[PDB]
Design a protein around this ligand. Sequence first.
Ligand SMILES: *C(=O)[C@@H](NC(=O)/C(=N/OC)c1csc(N)n1)[C@@H]1N=C(C(=O)O)C(=C)CS1
Length: 247
Amino acid sequence: QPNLYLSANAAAVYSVENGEALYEQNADKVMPIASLSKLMTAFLVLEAVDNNELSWDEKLDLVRLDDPSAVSLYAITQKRTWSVRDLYSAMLTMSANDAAETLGDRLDGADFPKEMNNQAKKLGMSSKTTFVSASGLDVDGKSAVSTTKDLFLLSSKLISTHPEVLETTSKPTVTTDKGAKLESTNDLLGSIQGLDGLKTGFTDEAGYCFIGTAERGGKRVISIVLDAGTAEKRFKDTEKLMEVGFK
Ligand SMILES: *C(=O)[C@@H](NC(=O)/C(=N/OC)c1csc(N)n1)[C@@H]1N=C(C(=O)O)C(=C)CS1
């Protein structure tokens, strides 16, 4: 294993072909993951469409967040009603917390965190992973937590089960049918060849986090960065991890 000098406190990169570690640092350490939880919500949304339980065209009113200063789709647009499709894009591109919570409530109401943790178990994530909400926001003072190993297993399961997730996470901007522009938080899109995902997150406690995925020559790698120092440094660590991934 090479010696990287990452900003991140915990980090890794894995090959999807065999799941094997190409670089690992604190890969078993339980870490706050915040907005990365929205990948589980996306997965459960996609499962529900395949299972004939959710329509992409259903219109839903955004649920109201307790904190106004939270990053929310409603704050930016002043529009309450959105299709399931647009809420899912809004969740994945701009990390809209109210979008994620609206999808969680529609899927299972108050039991949605249990469904998230049920699915975590199905996908092979260890018991150190705990989801608390569809958006990744704290609930009753409890935080969503995971490990870079469990995040890898979740991400590759998401991409292998629902490859169309990347059709959304590869776009620097998603334009809805009615013309709303939803800007991705993934500034590495277009900077690294093959890069088409996956999800950013940030809290004071979690630091700056990003799950990256790229594919070249039939080889896919997934990179995990938790608790980088700045929004830019999580992408610098990811650039470093991707080079190790495609060596
Ligand atoms: C996911 O992590 C989201 N993070 C939050 O909603 C925050 N939670 O703190 C309790 C938060 C605090 S401060 C701040 N700017 N967000 C989304 N993650 C980011 C990101 O990756 O930088 C977004 C740009 C919107 S919120």
